[PDB]
Design an enzyme around this catalytic site. Structure first.
Site, PDB file in Angstrom:
ATOM      1  N   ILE A   1     -27.004   1.496 -33.893  1.00 20.16           N
ATOM      2  CA  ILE A   1     -28.142   0.802 -34.479  1.00 20.16           C
ATOM      3  C   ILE A   1     -29.079   1.866 -35.050  1.00 20.16           C
ATOM      4  CG2 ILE A   1     -30.175  -0.654 -33.901  1.00 20.16           C
ATOM      5  CD1 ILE A   1     -28.274  -1.650 -31.489  1.00 20.16           C
TER       6      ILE A   1
ATOM      7  N   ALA B   1     -24.729   2.365 -28.337  1.00 20.72           N
ATOM      8  CA  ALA B   1     -24.864   1.027 -27.774  1.00 20.72           C
ATOM      9  C   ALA B   1     -24.279  -0.039 -28.709  1.00 20.72           C
ATOM     10  CB  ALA B   1     -26.322   0.733 -27.461  1.00 20.72           C
TER      11      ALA B   1
ATOM     12  N   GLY C   1       0.742  -6.335   1.677  1.00 19.34           N
ATOM     13  CA  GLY C   1       0.181  -6.442   0.325  1.00 19.34           C
ATOM     14  C   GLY C   1       1.094  -7.165  -0.656  1.00 19.34           C
TER      15      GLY C   1
ATOM     16  N   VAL D   1       0.808  -1.219   0.000  1.00 20.86           N
ATOM     17  CA  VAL D   1       0.000   0.000   0.000  1.00 20.86           C
ATOM     18  C   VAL D   1       0.847   1.277   0.000  1.00 20.86           C
ATOM     19  CG1 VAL D   1      -1.570   1.393   1.438  1.00 20.86           C
ATOM     20  CG2 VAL D   1      -2.041  -1.068   1.077  1.00 20.86           C
TER      21      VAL D   1
HETATM   22  C1  LIG Z   1     -25.256   3.778 -25.097  1.00 23.64           C
HETATM   23  C2  LIG Z   1     -26.155   4.738 -24.354  1.00 23.64           C
HETATM   24  C3  LIG Z   1     -26.404   5.932 -24.905  1.00 23.64           C
HETATM   25  C4  LIG Z   1     -27.267   6.942 -24.249  1.00 23.64           C
HETATM   26  O1  LIG Z   1     -27.848   6.686 -23.203  1.00 23.64           O
HETATM   27  S1  LIG Z   1     -27.438   8.468 -24.934  1.00 23.64           S
HETATM   28  C5  LIG Z   1     -28.568   9.384 -23.940  1.00 23.64           C
HETATM   29  C6  LIG Z   1     -29.944   9.270 -24.564  1.00 23.64           C
HETATM   30  N1  LIG Z   1     -30.816  10.127 -23.770  1.00 23.64           N
HETATM   31  C7  LIG Z   1     -31.486  11.195 -24.211  1.00 23.64           C
HETATM   32  O2  LIG Z   1     -31.433  11.586 -25.367  1.00 23.64           O
HETATM   33  C8  LIG Z   1     -32.334  11.915 -23.195  1.00 23.64           C
HETATM   34  C9  LIG Z   1     -32.794  13.273 -23.719  1.00 23.64           C
HETATM   35  N2  LIG Z   1     -33.764  13.577 -22.701  1.00 23.64           N
HETATM   36  C10 LIG Z   1     -35.082  13.593 -22.768  1.00 23.64           C
HETATM   37  O3  LIG Z   1     -35.721  13.350 -23.788  1.00 23.64           O
HETATM   38  C11 LIG Z   1     -35.674  13.911 -21.416  1.00 23.64           C
HETATM   39  O4  LIG Z   1     -35.876  15.303 -21.199  1.00 23.64           O
HETATM   40  C12 LIG Z   1     -36.865  13.038 -21.024  1.00 23.64           C
HETATM   41  C13 LIG Z   1     -37.921  12.851 -22.115  1.00 23.64           C
HETATM   42  C14 LIG Z   1     -36.287  11.683 -20.633  1.00 23.64           C
HETATM   43  C15 LIG Z   1     -37.537  13.669 -19.802  1.00 23.64           C
HETATM   44  O5  LIG Z   1     -38.305  14.816 -20.201  1.00 23.64           O
HETATM   45  P1  LIG Z   1     -39.232  15.605 -19.146  1.00 23.64           P
HETATM   46  O6  LIG Z   1     -39.939  16.703 -19.896  1.00 23.64           O
HETATM   47  O7  LIG Z   1     -40.063  14.591 -18.400  1.00 23.64           O
HETATM   48  O8  LIG Z   1     -38.117  16.295 -18.210  1.00 23.64           O
HETATM   49  P2  LIG Z   1     -37.906  16.026 -16.624  1.00 23.64           P
HETATM   50  O9  LIG Z   1     -38.562  17.166 -15.875  1.00 23.64           O
HETATM   51  O10 LIG Z   1     -38.286  14.613 -16.241  1.00 23.64           O
HETATM   52  O11 LIG Z   1     -36.294  16.186 -16.543  1.00 23.64           O
HETATM   53  C16 LIG Z   1     -35.733  17.460 -16.225  1.00 23.64           C
HETATM   54  C17 LIG Z   1     -34.236  17.595 -16.511  1.00 23.64           C
HETATM   55  O12 LIG Z   1     -33.578  16.352 -16.796  1.00 23.64           O
HETATM   56  C18 LIG Z   1     -32.573  16.614 -17.773  1.00 23.64           C
HETATM   57  N3  LIG Z   1     -32.144  15.380 -18.483  1.00 23.64           N
HETATM   58  C19 LIG Z   1     -32.943  14.427 -18.995  1.00 23.64           C
HETATM   59  N4  LIG Z   1     -32.178  13.464 -19.554  1.00 23.64           N
HETATM   60  C20 LIG Z   1     -30.885  13.823 -19.374  1.00 23.64           C
HETATM   61  C21 LIG Z   1     -29.669  13.247 -19.721  1.00 23.64           C
HETATM   62  N5  LIG Z   1     -29.640  12.064 -20.378  1.00 23.64           N
HETATM   63  N6  LIG Z   1     -28.516  13.885 -19.395  1.00 23.64           N
HETATM   64  C22 LIG Z   1     -28.530  15.053 -18.732  1.00 23.64           C
HETATM   65  N7  LIG Z   1     -29.689  15.635 -18.383  1.00 23.64           N
HETATM   66  C23 LIG Z   1     -30.873  15.037 -18.699  1.00 23.64           C
HETATM   67  C24 LIG Z   1     -33.208  17.655 -18.678  1.00 23.64           C
HETATM   68  O13 LIG Z   1     -32.199  18.401 -19.366  1.00 23.64           O
HETATM   69  C25 LIG Z   1     -33.948  18.527 -17.683  1.00 23.64           C
HETATM   70  O14 LIG Z   1     -33.036  19.531 -17.236  1.00 23.64           O
HETATM   71  P3  LIG Z   1     -33.466  21.008 -16.734  1.00 23.64           P
HETATM   72  O15 LIG Z   1     -34.390  21.509 -17.824  1.00 23.64           O
HETATM   73  O16 LIG Z   1     -32.147  21.740 -16.650  1.00 23.64           O
HETATM   74  O17 LIG Z   1     -34.114  20.772 -15.392  1.00 23.64           O
HETATM   75  C1  LIG Z   2      -3.183  -5.087   3.239  1.00 24.45           C
HETATM   76  C2  LIG Z   2      -1.919  -4.452   2.710  1.00 24.45           C
HETATM   77  C3  LIG Z   2      -1.214  -3.661   3.528  1.00 24.45           C
HETATM   78  C4  LIG Z   2       0.033  -2.989   3.097  1.00 24.45           C
HETATM   79  O1  LIG Z   2       0.509  -3.197   1.989  1.00 24.45           O
HETATM   80  S1  LIG Z   2       0.803  -1.909   4.132  1.00 24.45           S
HETATM   81  C5  LIG Z   2       2.271  -1.348   3.337  1.00 24.45           C
HETATM   82  C6  LIG Z   2       3.427  -2.193   3.832  1.00 24.45           C
HETATM   83  N1  LIG Z   2       4.626  -1.623   3.230  1.00 24.45           N
HETATM   84  C7  LIG Z   2       5.663  -1.093   3.885  1.00 24.45           C
HETATM   85  O2  LIG Z   2       5.715  -1.022   5.103  1.00 24.45           O
HETATM   86  C8  LIG Z   2       6.794  -0.576   3.035  1.00 24.45           C
HETATM   87  C9  LIG Z   2       7.760   0.274   3.855  1.00 24.45           C
HETATM   88  N2  LIG Z   2       8.823   0.378   2.892  1.00 24.45           N
HETATM   89  C10 LIG Z   2      10.015  -0.190   2.886  1.00 24.45           C
HETATM   90  O3  LIG Z   2      10.429  -0.930   3.773  1.00 24.45           O
HETATM   91  C11 LIG Z   2      10.764   0.172   1.624  1.00 24.45           C
HETATM   92  O4  LIG Z   2      11.553   1.348   1.752  1.00 24.45           O
HETATM   93  C12 LIG Z   2      11.486  -0.997   0.958  1.00 24.45           C
HETATM   94  C13 LIG Z   2      12.296  -1.886   1.905  1.00 24.45           C
HETATM   95  C14 LIG Z   2      10.407  -1.828   0.274  1.00 24.45           C
HETATM   96  C15 LIG Z   2      12.432  -0.431  -0.103  1.00 24.45           C
HETATM   97  O5  LIG Z   2      13.594   0.136   0.526  1.00 24.45           O
HETATM   98  P1  LIG Z   2      14.827   0.688  -0.348  1.00 24.45           P
HETATM   99  O6  LIG Z   2      15.893   1.150   0.611  1.00 24.45           O
HETATM  100  O7  LIG Z   2      15.186  -0.360  -1.372  1.00 24.45           O
HETATM  101  O8  LIG Z   2      14.172   1.999  -1.016  1.00 24.45           O
HETATM  102  P2  LIG Z   2      13.958   2.254  -2.604  1.00 24.45           P
HETATM  103  O9  LIG Z   2      15.080   3.151  -3.079  1.00 24.45           O
HETATM  104  O10 LIG Z   2      13.717   0.961  -3.350  1.00 24.45           O
HETATM  105  O11 LIG Z   2      12.577   3.105  -2.549  1.00 24.45           O
HETATM  106  C16 LIG Z   2      12.634   4.530  -2.505  1.00 24.45           C
HETATM  107  C17 LIG Z   2      11.326   5.216  -2.109  1.00 24.45           C
HETATM  108  O12 LIG Z   2      10.184   4.348  -2.107  1.00 24.45           O
HETATM  109  C18 LIG Z   2       9.333   4.761  -1.039  1.00 24.45           C
HETATM  110  N3  LIG Z   2       8.377   3.695  -0.638  1.00 24.45           N
HETATM  111  C19 LIG Z   2       8.661   2.397  -0.428  1.00 24.45           C
HETATM  112  N4  LIG Z   2       7.526   1.748  -0.086  1.00 24.45           N
HETATM  113  C20 LIG Z   2       6.524   2.659  -0.095  1.00 24.45           C
HETATM  114  C21 LIG Z   2       5.161   2.592   0.165  1.00 24.45           C
HETATM  115  N5  LIG Z   2       4.590   1.413   0.506  1.00 24.45           N
HETATM  116  N6  LIG Z   2       4.413   3.722   0.077  1.00 24.45           N
HETATM  117  C22 LIG Z   2       4.964   4.896  -0.271  1.00 24.45           C
HETATM  118  N7  LIG Z   2       6.278   4.992  -0.530  1.00 24.45           N
HETATM  119  C23 LIG Z   2       7.072   3.887  -0.443  1.00 24.45           C
HETATM  120  C24 LIG Z   2      10.300   5.166   0.060  1.00 24.45           C
HETATM  121  O13 LIG Z   2       9.670   6.072   0.970  1.00 24.45           O
HETATM  122  C25 LIG Z   2      11.398   5.855  -0.725  1.00 24.45           C
HETATM  123  O14 LIG Z   2      11.031   7.229  -0.853  1.00 24.45           O
HETATM  124  P3  LIG Z   2      12.080   8.454  -0.992  1.00 24.45           P
HETATM  125  O15 LIG Z   2      13.065   8.220   0.134  1.00 24.45           O
HETATM  126  O16 LIG Z   2      11.209   9.675  -0.814  1.00 24.45           O
HETATM  127  O17 LIG Z   2      12.641   8.308  -2.385  1.00 24.45           O
HETATM  128 CL   LIG Z   3     -27.060   1.792 -30.782  1.00 30.05          CL
END
Ligand SMILES: C/C=C/C(=O)SCCNC(=O)CCNC(=O)[C@@H](O)C(C)(C)COP(=O)(O)OP(=O)(O)OC[C@H]1O[C@@H](n2cnc3c(N)ncnc32)[C@H](O)[C@@H]1OP(=O)(O)O
Ligand SMILES: C/C=C/C(=O)SCCNC(=O)CCNC(=O)[C@@H](O)C(C)(C)COP(=O)(O)OP(=O)(O)OC[C@H]1O[C@@H](n2cnc3c(N)ncnc32)[C@H](O)[C@@H]1OP(=O)(O)O
Ligand SMILES: [Cl-]
Ligand SMILES: C/C=C/C(=O)SCCNC(=O)CCNC(=O)[C@@H](O)C(C)(C)COP(=O)(O)OP(=O)(O)OC[C@H]1O[C@@H](n2cnc3c(N)ncnc32)[C@H](O)[C@@H]1OP(=O)(O)O
Ligand SMILES: [Cl-]
Ligand SMILES: [Cl-]
Lengths: 563, 563, 563
Positions: free
Chosen positions: B403, B443, B194, B151
């Site tokens: 489509i 899509a 880790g 980590v």
């Molecule tokens: C692979 C996948 C591809 C895609 O999904 S592409 C997206 C296809 N979707 C559309 O073309 C939807 C165009 N919308 C309508 O016809 C839509 O009004 C609708 C026909 C639903 C809904 O129309 P309404 O008249 O019922 O409007 P609402 O009050 O329910 O919604 C209001 C609000 O939602 C917004 N809205 C609705 N759909 C979206 C989306 N999608 N993104 C961001 N904002 C959205 C709309 O701009 C409006 O914004 P404001 O005027 O600023 O309040």
């Molecule tokens: C569920 C999982 C849990 C966990 O993983 S908890 C993490 C357990 N890990 C540790 O305790 C590692 C402590 N590190 C050592 O002993 C580590 O020096 C080590 C023993 C490797 C490596 O020691 P080295 O002397 O070989 O140091 P390096 O030149 O290879 O690395 C340099 C650099 O890496 C940095 N380093 C190494 N490990 C980390 C991590 N992990 N995060 C951020 N930075 C890191 C270290 O601070 C150093 O920073 P600077 O001095 O600023 O250059």
């Molecule tokens: Cl499509």
């Protein structure tokens, strides 16, 4: 070069050198294994067109194609003996499993072109869904070596229609694609209709120059007269290379022969995303500190005998290391983290033996290893949930006789806790493998990452010591017939019939023939399958949990230190 | 060695050799481009610690680190001038964009260590989310070159809290991980709080030997007295390597210097998953058949002047090839497939000029190029849907004024059809690039693959001829003020204020400073960005459509032949 | 008639009758609250068209429309004072929040027709995404009371373009639909362009008889002359009822007046899916056993003074009941299950005061309430993960000064554990509420279920006693400037500047104006918001955990009994 060695390296080591080897036990296990291998050999050899005949006609067999594709030693077959509909040659007419190709795992399916030109046969569709499911869950590339004449005409009613019939894999292929999971096919021979769709549904098509794929292929005296005339016209089989290469461009590449097609496949596999597995490793890959051969002594074929599960774990995972979750709580189970080629997995395994002063909701009781109680079920729920959060795949080692029964168990919530485990699994959202060490029985088989979890289980394998049954035959005979005996020799006969049937229908080979377990594997193949599974699971995982953000190791540690 | 050359190769070619060059137009465009380059140079140069000073102290700058990491010529900066909160040096204290690393595209974020030691500054969190979003959509690795003091104390309210504040990237990093997308960080210098969370949140941590990350770092006469005493005690900055390597093992690897850290980063990038793009190509990569330099004459800075969009397409895509979808239907748009380094993309671009006897729902009308009507909207809906199904990425070239409007347009369904296009895009689930050629307005800017599609548009770029606004300033002024003028000079002033503001806030530099467009790119950089995008998109896609299962080419063909 | 009364009913009760009331503290809190109310009143009243004017023209205002729609007393506004861009009337031109309609919770957005006919203003787009995000995460119907003239012309650059500008909600509306979440709009007045798309993007369109929606609407001497002529021609605003009802049928229903439109909306809301909450209740709804008015004495405005968080929890949740998870482990936090109108929630709140012999990883130390240490971070990781599994939503009450710092803390894994919490949250995949009681500071604000978790935090609210900052100003001043003081009065000044800035930029009103917290709520409104949130979360959740399959209560119980 790995995260957190304090958690993942130098884990506690386990197991002990084998001091009492058991040659008889080893012989019994190996007898089952040998029978499996012999049955697979016979099954693959069977068919009207032999491998020699295929080769002379310009085609490789399924196994020749698979062996050409994969890296030596990486073949992990699944469903080898799967044959739920009792087809005569013992198969579903496909060969399937995991294989590696220039380092990348892949799941492989090959049409059996020896049998009816690779026709769809009863049971094949179920087998094929097991394949695509595995690929789905692991986010793993699926490879077809295809040579498929489609529906077997006489059996069309069983292979053509229905929700899980021949058409289902085409939708499954589209599902894979849509999940980002590529499907590559080598296209061989004629592939019409059903075979055509197997050809066109994948992402990448590599064809043999003489191959084809088509909606429909070329397929009493007038019938003979028509066939001879059309054969003289030399009309090409529909969908040949001049069509699907030159015209439609659906065949991306064409090769002159079967090995060419394989090489084309290899090239496309080389293009696929995959992680290099090193990404996910927590350690360098290490062998176990104790030999797998010992398993032949450790795991008893005597189903009444307990054993130490730690001795098994020690022999399957890297460096014999294990990090146990909540040791001492739910002592009937082991839950913990281990490594496979350096990759993390969660292991969940039964403890055998008797457990003194247990469980805690009963007075003056002894716990039975292999059973599930309150604490084990809660521990597993927690562990599955933790692994799920951590993205760690689960491997389950089953040897179980069920959740504890009776109103004390009911009050301890066991029914609710077993289903909670099912919920926890379902929640995990990670691929999973299940390995049956010995016993898969009761609802415990389901809750222990069973294959009934269809969102998580990739497939299932078992050792030669495994057996599957609802409950022991004697218990079932009592449950079935005890009331009938009171109300009333014919019943007694029915009971003995049942006891024998339960034995017959629970043998390893039978279990895999029906698909209860996808493959019976050798004791020395268990780790190989674990390796293939784990590497596949991590090859391209769909979720990650960074190691330093994992909870399982932390929770494990806290339990050790806080209490 | 490509699928379906009949559809994807030798496509119709478009464009013509430039016969009338316009030196004045070229000079005007280049004046905008030069201003952008000069502003970027000044921004990157700024800070209390110079590049020279950093280098002497053992540190590289953001640009030195980026240039060390990437393949020469592959830098595609994004958000260079993004500075929504107006920080003094013009930046969010990070440098970001796409770069290639051994052939792999990655998304890059570098802390600017010249400025407060890379502190979080207002706007940085939003910039960081754009980075992780791009990585997410493309499933692309995210790389941090981190040097972040956390980590920025004086700005804590803007960088520490809130939904999209300094804490958000930490969750985004966990999301990336859980989606399976890796995040890799090189950790330089002191990163407290880790900075500490930026260090720990990624998937992979690679540290400089002298770097640190911490929850909290070391950070009137008594304050001086305290600081000198503690500095003599030599207490190390919290979370230095002895802690986060040796103890916690959170730093996976440590390297001796800045280039080492970069090389470690490169290695892990090599592991990451990425396709060889050849997998997805339908042709060998080919340059356009016509030079991009011509764009300096083709695209008029005179916003009232039309031009031939085909001349632009011809100069951006491979071999000047284009496969138009439904030419003659919806003449206000061009839709079609093209190639980028051999990879398929779908191109969709406004047609400029006047369209006789158009549109079809009005009598004796002329169509306005840049606007969208019924057929163009339907054509685009269809094309997007088709490309989506086909997993083909889309590149949109915007120059639009909306489509059509009015009740005739409303009755022709235009409001519904524009939104249907939005739906179609959202449905596509694919990464897409948008390039504002000149006008982004109404899509229409949204519907034409606009950056408002946060799941699909990876980022957006614009030429020096671009401008962004709800509508022209004059039209807006009328719409805003026409009723007010009737009801009522102060209004007149507001109208002229608006017209000028619309001009000022629509200039290219302003648009990119606010992030309306991620980068203003040179005419000769448009194809380079298309190339980076397309190659990134296909590097690790999470879904696939096989070429032979694509519909777009088939539908395109049928329209050509059936009518 | 509820599951598991043994777990969910007759929970431990907390809090005590207030024995020492503090009138001065109450007065100070109420002074902040009164300022908030007065600022909201002024903001809502502002605009060129008043409520009276609207009413006379046949229109209701935003608040009149909202009040007509909802069940009396159920309005829970959010972002009332949100205004990050400092718009003159103090708002983003919309009114938003939760309201109940015949028992069903819905998310409401109303255009402010008092201000530029409801135009898009700077900050509005960010506000609108917070609305659809909340609906997305809760799967809750989204209701627009729309009266929107589109882009505010003078501010087009801030509302029209960009990734998170006016076009983004249209994609978000399609996303909601595609996720199965309905969007219903009442269309009032003129809605062109931007307003047009807000009209057409929803699922259901209900129009006022005089309303319109259009692509483009009707919108120096010659300009005046043109406007008067066209206004006499009586040309109707484009897209009026004769067009969008009679011709296009896009307006599904038309009503004669604003209340009619509201009644039409009510009818479609009645059609929507929703659980009766009784389904998920575990108890009958019960008021707390202690009055909320006491919070005015309990929560000190003196940020140095501690208080008992249990006294706050006791006054916010049903029957003052609380089932604490892992009491005694991580004593710096309270984590536990509570009830809100009979529904389960997980509550996570800071403990204030000094904690003897703590934390456990330091010797002879005292823990500081409001800070986070090892056990608290692990406990929270576990609790979040458990609630996640159980599907129980989390409510986080923040009053924090950060995670512990220094190398002892670093070794205890605090940096990793804080990020693990971020991971756990991201993993939870459930909607969560965050309520800032007093201090949201440091990275602790992120990890404590902060709003930086965009997939989980639905929105956040804070009391009048709240404050947000990276750290105290004095501390930051030292951190920022201590070195500079040594190297060197100008610095001293910078320090005092910083101290003051930190105070200024951390005040409740500032925090909500910037969206650091969505709403500052009265002490007596905290439970109402918890009730709205929890009931909304359970109305149509997309995941369930059956009560009998929940793990949190089981794990809580086991820790109590096992140790
Ligand atoms: C692979 C996948 C591809 C895609 O999904 S592409 C997206 C296809 N979707 C559309 O073309 C939807 C165009 N919308 C309508 O016809 C839509 O009004 C609708 C026909 C639903 C809904 O129309 P309404 O008249 O019922 O409007 P609402 O009050 O329910 O919604 C209001 C609000 O939602 C917004 N809205 C609705 N759909 C979206 C989306 N999608 N993104 C961001 N904002 C959205 C709309 O701009 C409006 O914004 P404001 O005027 O600023 O309040
Ligand atoms: C569920 C999982 C849990 C966990 O993983 S908890 C993490 C357990 N890990 C540790 O305790 C590692 C402590 N590190 C050592 O002993 C580590 O020096 C080590 C023993 C490797 C490596 O020691 P080295 O002397 O070989 O140091 P390096 O030149 O290879 O690395 C340099 C650099 O890496 C940095 N380093 C190494 N490990 C980390 C991590 N992990 N995060 C951020 N930075 C890191 C270290 O601070 C150093 O920073 P600077 O001095 O600023 O250059
Ligand atoms: Cl499509
Ligand atoms: C929705 C799905 C629908 C369908 O799948 S319908 C089935 C479509 N399939 C066909 O029409 C294949 C017709 N076959 C050919 O052209 C096939 O010869 C063929 C062109 C491949 C293969 O022809 P070959 O000359 O190469 O024959 P093979 O030595 O490879 O095959 C020998 C064997 O397979 C048998 N065969 C081949 N396909 C099938 C099938 N499918 N069912 C049962 N038996 C089959 C064939 O009858 C032969 O039987 P025998 O003479 O008794 O040994
Ligand atoms: Cl059971
Ligand atoms: Cl912190």
């Amino acid at each position: 070069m790995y995260s957190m060695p304090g958690y993942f390296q130098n884990m506690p080591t386990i197991g002990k050198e084998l001091v009492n080897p058991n040659p008889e036990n080893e012989q019994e296990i190996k007898a089952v294994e040998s029978d499996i291998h012999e049955s697979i050999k016979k099954a693959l050899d069977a068919g009207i067109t032999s491998e020699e005949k295929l080769n002379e006609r310009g085609q490789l067999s399924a196994m020749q194609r698979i062996n050409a594709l994969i890296d030596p030693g990486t073949w992990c077959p699944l469903n080898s003996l799967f044959n739920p509909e009792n087809n005569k040659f013992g198969t579903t007419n496909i060969v399937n499993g995991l294989g590696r190709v220039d380092g990348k795992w892949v799941y492989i399916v090959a049409s059996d072109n020896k049998k009816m030109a690779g026709a769809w046969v009863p049971g094949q569709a179920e087998n094929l869904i097991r394949c695509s499911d595995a690929a789905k869950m692991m986010h793993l590339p699926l490879i077809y070596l295809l040579n498929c004449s489609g529906v077997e005409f006489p059996n069309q009613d069983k292979v053509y229609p229905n929700r899980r019939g021949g058409g289902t894999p085409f939708f499954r292929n589209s599902e894979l694609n849509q999940l980002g999971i590529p499907v590559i096919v080598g296209i061989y021979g004629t592939n019409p209709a059903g075979g055509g769709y197997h050809s066109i549904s994948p992402t990448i098509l590599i064809a043999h120059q003489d191959a084809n794929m088509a909606v429909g292929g070329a397929g009493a005296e007038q019938i003979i007269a028509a066939q001879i005339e059309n054969s003289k016209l030399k009309v090409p089989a529909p969908g040949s290379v001049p069509i699907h290469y030159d015209e439609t461009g659906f065949f991306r590449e064409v090769y002159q022969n079967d090995l060419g097609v394989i090489d084309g496949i290899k090239k496309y596999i080389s293009y696929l995303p995959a992680y290099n597995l090193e990404f996910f490793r927590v350690d360098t890959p290490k062998a176990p500190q104790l030999p797998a051969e010992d398993l032949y002594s450790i795991i008893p074929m005597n189903q009444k005998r307990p054993y130490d599960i730690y001795e098994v774990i020690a022999r399957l995972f890297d460096n014999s290391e294990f990090s146990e979750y909540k040791k001492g709580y739910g002592p009937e189970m082991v839950t913990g983290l281990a490594k496979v080629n350096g990759l993390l997995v969660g292991v969940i395994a039964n403890v055998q033996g008797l457990l003194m002063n247990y469980p805690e909701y009963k007075q003056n009781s002894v716990g039975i290893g292999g059973k599930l109680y309150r604490q084990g079920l809660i521990k597993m729920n927690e562990f599955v949930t933790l692994c799920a959060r951590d993205r760690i795949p689960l491997i389950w080692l089953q040897d179980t006789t069920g959740i504890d029964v009776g109103d004390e168990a009911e009050k301890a919530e066991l029914l609710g806790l077993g289903q909670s485990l099912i919920y926890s699994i379902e929640n995990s959202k990670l691929p999973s493998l299940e390995i049956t060490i010995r016993k898969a029985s009761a609802a415990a088989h389901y809750v222990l990452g069973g294959p009934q979890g269809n969102n998580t289980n990739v497939f299932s394998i078992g050792t030669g010591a495994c057996e599957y049954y609802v409950m022991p035959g004697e218990t079932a005979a009592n449950a079935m017939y005890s009331r009938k005996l009171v109300k009333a020799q014919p019943i007694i006969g029915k009971m003995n019939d049942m006891i024998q049937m339960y034995t017959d229908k629970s043998r390893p080979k039978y279990c895999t023939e029906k698909g209860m377990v996808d493959e019976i594997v050798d004791m020395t193949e268990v780790r190989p399958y674990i390796q293939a599974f784990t590497e596949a699971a991590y090859q391209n995982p769909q979720s990650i949990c960074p190691m330093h953000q994992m909870l399982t190791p932390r929770s494990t540690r806290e339990f050790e230190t806080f209490g």
